[PDB]
Amino acid sequence: AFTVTVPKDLYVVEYGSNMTIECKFPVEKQLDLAALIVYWEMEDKNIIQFVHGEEDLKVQHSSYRQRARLLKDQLSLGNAALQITDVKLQDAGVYRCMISYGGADYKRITVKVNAAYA
């Protein structure tokens, strides 16, 4: 019954724009950080590995270093939002948001990138 949901499963963004991909999960009362794990992945590349409040950016894949972060202000709202800055062409593809918060679910999100003069 634990369900991750996405308001959008297709993002079409410009090269060089910023982009926030939303990933929603059920938060009944206060957020219990001790229970929450967030995994963002994109085709065998690890972007976010949030564990109970702790992250090692040493494990974020190099092509996302500096450019990708979890909006941790939104997790209290049950929104594990992935913000990507200075969008690149390589960022295009299928993203997975996986949330373990007691139960576990995931959702697939497609990003398509348009080159600057298309």
Binding site: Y39, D44, N46, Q49, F50, D56, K58, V59, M98, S100
Partner: peptide, 15 residues
């Protein structure tokens, strides 16, 4: 999975 520290892979998983 779920060592923060280690690298994961799909689905939870340590590739």
């Amino acid at each position: 999975f779920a060592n923060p520290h280690l690298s994961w892979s799909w689905x939870x998983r340590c590739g």
